[PDB]
Amino acid sequence: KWKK
DNA sequence: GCTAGCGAGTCC
DNA sequence: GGACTCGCTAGC
């Protein structure tokens, strides 16, 4: 997963 | 924690 | 293109  | 699997992202 | 990186899921 690719988020802050 | 180990071993196994999925899919978007990184370095050469 | 390939080995590698990383978040999440799964069985044990």
Q: State the structure-solving technique.
A: NMR
**Tokens 């802050």 sit at which residue?**
A4
Q: Encoding tokens for residue A1?
A: 């997963």
Distance between the two ends of chain A, CA-based, in angstroms?
Answer: 10
CA–C1' A2–B10 (A)? 13
Q: Encoding tokens for residue A4?
A: 């802050």
Cα A2 to the center of its chain, rounded Å: 2
- Mapped onto helix, strand or coil, the DSSP state of residue A4 is coil
CA–C1' A2–C10 (A)? 21
CA–C1' A4–C12 (A)? 32
CA–C1' A3–B8 (A)? 12
CB half-sphere exposure, A3, CA atoms < 13 A: 1
